[PDB]
Amino acid sequence: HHHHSSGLVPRG
Amino acid sequence: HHHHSSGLVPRGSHMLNSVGFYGKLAGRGDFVSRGLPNTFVEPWDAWLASGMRASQDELGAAWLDAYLTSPLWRFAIAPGLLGGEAVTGVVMPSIDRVGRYFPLTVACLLPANADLGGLVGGDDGWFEQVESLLLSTLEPEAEVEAFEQAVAQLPAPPCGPRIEQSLISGNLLRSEAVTPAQRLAALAQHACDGASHWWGRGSARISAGLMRYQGLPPAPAFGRFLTGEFPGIP
Amino acid sequence: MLNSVGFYGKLAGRGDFVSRGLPNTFVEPWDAWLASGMRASQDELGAAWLDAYLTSPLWRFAIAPGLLGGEAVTGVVMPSIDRVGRYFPLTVACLLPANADLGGLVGGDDGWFEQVESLLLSTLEPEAEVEAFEQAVAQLPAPPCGPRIEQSLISGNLLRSEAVTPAQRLAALAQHACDGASHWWGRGSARISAGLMRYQGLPPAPAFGRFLTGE
Amino acid sequence: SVGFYGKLAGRGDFVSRGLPNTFVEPWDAWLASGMRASQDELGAAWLDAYLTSPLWRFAIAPGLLGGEAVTGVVMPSIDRVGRYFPLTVACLLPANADLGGLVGGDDGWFEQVESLLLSTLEPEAEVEAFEQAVAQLPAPPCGPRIEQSLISGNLLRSEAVTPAQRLAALAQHACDGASHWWGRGSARISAGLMRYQGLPPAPAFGRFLTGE
Amino acid sequence: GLVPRGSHMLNSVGFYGKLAGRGDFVSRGLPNTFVEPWDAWLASGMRASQDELGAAWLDAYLTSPLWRFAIAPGLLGGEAVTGVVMPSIDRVGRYFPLTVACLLPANADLGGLVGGDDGWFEQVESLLLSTLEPEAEVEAFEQAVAQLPAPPCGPRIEQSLISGNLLRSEAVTPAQRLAALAQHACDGASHWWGRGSARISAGLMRYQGLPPAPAFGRFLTG
Amino acid sequence: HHHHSSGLVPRGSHMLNSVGFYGKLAGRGDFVSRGLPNTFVEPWDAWLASGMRASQDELGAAWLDAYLTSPLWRFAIAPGLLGGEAVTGVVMPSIDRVGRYFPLTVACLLPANADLGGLVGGDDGWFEQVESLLLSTLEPEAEVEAFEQAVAQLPAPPCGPRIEQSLISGNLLRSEAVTPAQRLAALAQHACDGASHWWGRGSARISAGLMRYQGLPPAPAFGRFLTGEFPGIP
Amino acid sequence: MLNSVGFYGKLAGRGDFVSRGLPNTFVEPWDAWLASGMRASQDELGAAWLDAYLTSPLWRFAIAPGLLGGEAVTGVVMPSIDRVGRYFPLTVACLLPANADLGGLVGGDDGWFEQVESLLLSTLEPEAEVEAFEQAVAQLPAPPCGPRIEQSLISGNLLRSEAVTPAQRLAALAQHACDGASHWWGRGSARISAGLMRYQGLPPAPAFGRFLTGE
Amino acid sequence: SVGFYGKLAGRGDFVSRGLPNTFVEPWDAWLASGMRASQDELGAAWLDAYLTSPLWRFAIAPGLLGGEAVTGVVMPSIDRVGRYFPLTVACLLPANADLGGLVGGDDGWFEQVESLLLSTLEPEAEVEAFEQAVAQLPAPPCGPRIEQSLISGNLLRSEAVTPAQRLAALAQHACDGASHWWGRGSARISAGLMRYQGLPPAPAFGRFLTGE
Amino acid sequence: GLVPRGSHMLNSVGFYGKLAGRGDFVSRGLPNTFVEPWDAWLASGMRASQDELGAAWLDAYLTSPLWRFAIAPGLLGGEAVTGVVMPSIDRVGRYFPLTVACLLPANADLGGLVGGDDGWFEQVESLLLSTLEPEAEVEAFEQAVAQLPAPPCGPRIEQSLISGNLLRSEAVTPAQRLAALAQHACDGASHWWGRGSARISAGLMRYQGLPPAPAFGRFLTG
Amino acid sequence: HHHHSSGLVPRG
Fold first, then answer.
1. I99 CA to centre of own chain
2. Contacting residues for B46 by C-beta, under 8 A, at least 6 apart
3. H156 at the F interface (CB within 8 A)?
């Protein structure tokens, strides 16, 4: 379990 | 690939520790659960429930007033008793929005090599912060948004790795302890192996109480968490 | 109520077994365990037994009440010899009252044990005065030692400790790890690494060889 | 968790939260009987004494004000219309707590309760700032007692096996069935400690106000 | 002649009873205002315990533990007393205890003795037991008691009884209040403790005044 | 007759202690003074002023930048040096509403039998509360109402009476000290007799500094309070 | 660098003056001050001098460096006697390095001084072995003692202390009260009350009578 | 009293209060040179390292970043538009302070500065709550050093006359002309302490991010 | 035969030099991997100081203080050393210092020695000075050194040199970091301290490696 | 100096 928040690669 | 699903997270703490809550919350409609995996939630829920049922059979009609005044309990549970990881946290008797009773717990999941004598035997400060978040949820204008927010910004409790041991030929265990401190630690860690420890202010009055069970406590004993069965004015 | 510290075994400057400051409730079972291990390790090691003995480490120990008579015992043991060249270990031992917390001992300051070590090694010096060793042991203090936190086993599965502080909780744990156990530790030899060993009860005779050789 | 009873500078008559009647009625009785007793004694001297009298920290053994033991602070106080009665912050400690550790431990919890009690006499003192802070008060530090037992009606026996436990056992005994009153005093009374077996008799209440 | 404070009491540590290498009752360093009421009390309890234990008495006696004591003023003279008493013998095999005692000013803080460090009492115990080894030089004992410092012990917190029954102490700190309370438990009392033995467990005992004669057997037995 | 001019005053503290302030306040037009009598204010003002003038003569044109960055000083002044009572408190360089520079001090007046070694040598906590009230007055929106209000609700610092002494035949003084604590106290109290002690964070950097002057410090030394004339990196 | 503690004066079991463990830089000025006071108090008290001496208290003392040679001195003194009945006090003294904080001594634990007291009084017992006293003094530890906080006198009116903590400030004060002084204290006699006495320098000879009698 | 410099999650480019340029310019230079150096070294591995890298407590001897010594905490940070740079809270300690007491004293002041630094990454993080709290920060506890002196170019001599002073003298020396970096580590780097004589060379900056 | 750990070093406390009641160089308990480089160093400094002080040398020598030392591994054999050295003499009046030394594992925490308790070193000083009293039994010295416990000394915090010149320690507490720093000051170094004397003030001295020969006079003089 | 605040006798 490594969950957290946000993400940094774009999602076009 | 980390930058695909998160991004700082300074100390990489979401890999080191999963801290979260499970149970009934006064502001919410049933069982809430954020932050914890599922090899913990399943056997934890199963155990809580068996004791709820067992204790109701024992206490009869006193159960409810026992439950409603029962203390909070701080705990430390050796790995493998609730699936893989070591567990520490606090459990509190609780309620949901439709008046159903189930306990609310905040837990920290730690690697199985965690030094658990450190937790039991160390500084209350973290267990005190967790108790204060829990007790505040039962306040009348408690914003459920707040408890969720605080448990997520809640750092794991200080826990270093344990002195490495090894059990030779079934009757001898050897620890790599070569100073008095490492031996004290080695003994404390061994008292925690395969065990669950519970303690706190005992509500009732003067104090709990450190309690140790081998493995999880049996169902007909869950009633001891709810009321009483110290010296001693002559 | 004799002397705080005593000794049993063989000194290089005496003929047979020697014994001061220790009741019989300790010496007899202690000598029994020692002779059982001596003989058992000689079987398991054969020709290699003598050379491992002449070089085995000094072992500091802490033994729960009941394993050798009623009182808890702490001390050091070292491979020793007598005047006519017969081999048997030399033990300095301090009896403690059964209420004693061995956890603070196993986990406490080395100072007392390190004196006891230096005193045992001195009996193997060219012409060490037997009486200088006896006198130094008879003036030794009992090592630092407090009472155990109170405990009770309940219903067969619950152990309750009257600990209420973090410090008391830590103490309660280590304490629990020592009950019914014997702990052994020291600087090791050139073949045994320094470390801490726990046995439930006294070690069985087959294990004694481990006190002499790693493998 | 921790309550109060008495008269508050910004409220009408009496005030009372967090404390059961098992405590309040005998506490009140003892305070009032002392008020009259001291008025009888000091005569014209009373008002100047009462008005500048000390704050008293107290520990009180089980049995004297209901079954629980109690600790707290009492201060000369006043209600909205200028009628006089003391204000008390108290904490119920049931039974097997060690009062020796309290009387002889840290001043901290008491020093807080003093601070709250005098802040009720400030000009802009908001009356809810008091109840609010007294309800966010923790109980004071009490430990378990040392096991003791009367034997044969002449022997008291304690399970103390060290200096520390023997020192505690003695203080414990000194608090048993008694009441302790200490603090910083006033301009009339020097700081100090007072003891009585049971609650002080009403003709003694004068010493809580003036010294000699 | 030379009496370096105008008094031989408090100068300081003495002893009374029987000593293995001497013939009758040895005694140094102690006034009669103590030695007489102490001997009376000891003897009275010797006789009570023989009445109560019959044939068990001798074997209870030869194995009974060393008892540390602190005794309030007015029970054995005006001075307070502290020390250690041990079952003893003389050269002709008669039995009587050996006491190493030290008189204290009436305002001694006995709560500090009872509740304080052990080193003084463990040092007295080491001297008393030495008199029973076979090679025991009688003069080595007298010499050691002569060089024994007095036991760590300063003054009690000044206290006074105001309104008939309200007791007031001059304690203004937590440490002082703890002291005041502990001294209050010792007034009019004698306290007894030690390592105990094989049959008599460790613990602290408080009697009002000297212990009664029928209680004396409790020191020998469990 | 007390109920004619006041009325509780719980611990009777206005008889035990007079705590107050004197000097220039940023919110007020000139010299303010509440709570202190006048046998203190006169010689205190005289001394401050002589040193102000003396230090200006010494420092030349550096005075102002020295004064404007000078530290705060905690003090303890034996009785009789400023009239009767013992004095303790804090002094801070300050300003008034029209830009004139004079120091602001909060002082506590104590009986001449006060134990002053206790103050110098005791807990900073009170001197820290007084420093914080003073520094806050120089804030831009500092309500002058607040400083007045806090200094009035400000309790006197803990100060017990001193070990009683007596000077026999001019070369011998005897104190009624009979325990180690009373002798330590007796010596500390004697170092304070007829003396003024000053200390604090030293602004400048690492620390002051305990300074002792016999009597009040002389005028040409007041400059030492404003700037510098500790080891010692090799 | 001899023995931590020494002694000077008259023992009941010796003929003349006796002296072990102390350099001459102390003994000579100490004996000088003592003889001056002895003679001076005999003038001031006449017939009453002898009976006051035979009963005067034990005085614990702490003497600033420079008053008796270069080192600070602490000790106890008691009225004593020799084998032929001549009267002169007996002193146990420990030299301390000049950096020593006498304030911690004057204000510290009684334990060392109370041993020294018991050892001096033992020399007046029926047949006390001279050698038992010498040996007990030669095995005595220097009493607990730390360095002074650093100080400097500045311009003639300012004393600066490098104290930065409350604890250091307290220590700086007491320390300052001891410099250039001698302090005297003890349990007193039946005519002198227990108390603490400060003199600047060594006490003058007229004052010595105060060590024997209140008034 | 205590300042900060770097990039704040809720501000545009760079931020800098309370710290002179005598410090900021060489601190910045050293951080940037390390950023590039580590990117060069770790390649594709860099971003995942930087993003989960530890907070580092540091003490830095006089001479290496201007004349004053400095202590503080540095954390991987980010600005409003997602550009990467570390955030630093720092406290200027000029000259004769004992860094041994700091590196080897209580974690408290550092533990606060960690707490403030991570609270800038919370969702609702108000940017003024940070400056406000960093300016109400006390300087950390530093004591005076033990007097020392190099003699004859081979001998170092300290005025230590006790165990305590000798222990302090040794630690003091160990900090002289050096920089210390410790903390709780990350998932990659175990807690520990790192030392360098002067500031770490840029090819070392990679170890501040990943371990082996 | 009986070697209770497979090594006579660390078993534990020995001595070298001249002893008043013996004839040439006494020596027990110490390997040659120490005694030889120690004697070489001592002798070389004896000769340097005579060259540099001329006629003052003898009187400087007979009055110089006892020096406590802790010496890093690799300067006198692979083991670390700690002990005390004293100006000494033999039965025939030749002059050479007497050292009581104890070898330590290469990972000994020397910062704990130098910065730790004094009791061990004060106990060694009391033995060394005893050999110079007139009634000095030579065997009472050997017996005491034989019963001397090793000096309180556990292991240094594990440390490693990563990126070429970045030193990393396993210190996770304030106490451990203090230890790590203090051990870092002792590596490759010898430390010297003591009560000093009348001409040589107290203080702590650190040389890189063994002190050079021309410095040896600093131990004798101020 | 015994100053304070308020007063308790009436002022008709």
1. 7
2. none
3. yes
Q: Where are the domains of chain F?
A: 1-234
**CB-based contacts of B39, cutoff 8 Å, min separation 6:** B82, B83, B84, B85
CA separation for the pair H102, H23 (Å, rounded): 19
| List of chain F residues whose C-beta atoms are within 8 Å of the C-beta of residue G197 | 172-174
C-alpha closest to that of E131 among E123, E120, E142, E122: E142
Question: In chain I, which residues have their Cβ closer than 8 Å to the Cβ of G1?
Answer: 65-66, 129, 195, 197
* H or E segment and range at residue C77: strand C72-78
DSSP D206: G
**Residue I52: both structure tokens together:** 């540099």
Structural determination approach = X-ray
Distance CA H202, CA H37 (A): 6
Nearest to G212 by CA among G7, G42, G17, G12: G42
- Report the alpha-carbon distance of residue E110 to residue E154 in Å, rounded: 9
The answer to whether chain G touches chain I by having 3 or more C-beta pairs less than 8 angstroms apart is: yes
Query: CB-based burial of residue H182 (10 Å sphere; 0-12 exposed, 13-18 middle, 19+ buried)?
Result: buried
Q: Do B184 and C103 touch (CB under 8 A)?
A: yes
Is residue C65 within 8 A of residue C72, CB to CB? The reply is: yes
List all chains that touch chain C, counting a touch as 3 or more CB pairs closer than 8 Å. Answer: B, D, E, I
Contact present, C209 and C45 (Cβ < 8 Å): yes
Q: Rounded distance, CA H13 to CA H61, Å? A: 29
CATH architecture for the domain at I1-222 = 3-Layer(aba) Sandwich (3.40)
To what resolution in angstroms was this structure determined?
2.7
Token readout for E171 is: 């304690």
Q: Is B158:B119 a contact under the CB 8 Å cutoff?
A: no
Q: G142 vs chain H: nearest CA distance in angstroms?
A: 15
Give CA separation, I10 vs C20, C121, C128, C188, I102, in Å.
28, 11, 19, 12, 7
Q: How far is CA G187 from CA G75, G89, G190, in A?
A: 14, 17, 9
The verdict on F121 touching G (C-beta cutoff 8 Å) is: yes
Looking at the complex, report in whole angstroms how far the Cα of residue F205 sits from the nearest Cα belonging to chain H: 7
Half-sphere exposure (Cβ direction) of F169: Cα atoms closer than 13 Å: 11
Yes or no: domain F1-234 corresponds to CATH 3.40.1730.10:
yes
Spell out which residues of chain E touch residue D196, defining contact as CB-CB under 8 Å. 165-167
User: Shortest Cα distance from I155 to chain B (angstroms)?
Assistant: 8
Structure tokens at E12: 């300081």
Name the strands in the sheet holding F104-110, side by side, starting at the edge strand that comes first in the sequence: F31-34, F18-24, F104-110, F86-92, F73-77, F195-199, F210-214, G158-161, G151-154
Cβ–Cβ of J3/F9 closer than 8 Å?
no
Residue E221 at interface with chain D, using a CB cutoff of 8 Å: no
Tokens of B34: 């954020």
Which residue in C55, C58, C132 is closest to I143 by CB distance? C132
Determine the Cα–Cα distance for residues C81 and C15; give it in Å rounded to an integer. 9
- The CATH code for residues C1-215 is 3.40.1730.10
**Right CATH number for H1-212 from 3.40.1730.10, 3.90.79.10, 3.30.450.20, 3.30.70.260?**
3.40.1730.10
**How many Å lie between the alpha carbon of B160 and the closest alpha carbon of chain I?**
9
Q: What is the 3-state secondary structure (H, E, C) of B155-191?
A: CCCCCCECCCCCEECCCEEEECCCCHHHHHHHHHHHH
Question: Under an 8 A CB cutoff, do H192 and I168 touch?
Answer: yes
Q: Does E107 touch chain G (CB under 8 A)?
A: no
Q: Strand H3-6 to strand H148-151: parallel, antiparallel, or no bridges (unpaired)?
A: unpaired
Q: Token pair for residue G201?
A: 């320098």
Chain C contact for B170 (CB, 8 A cutoff) = no
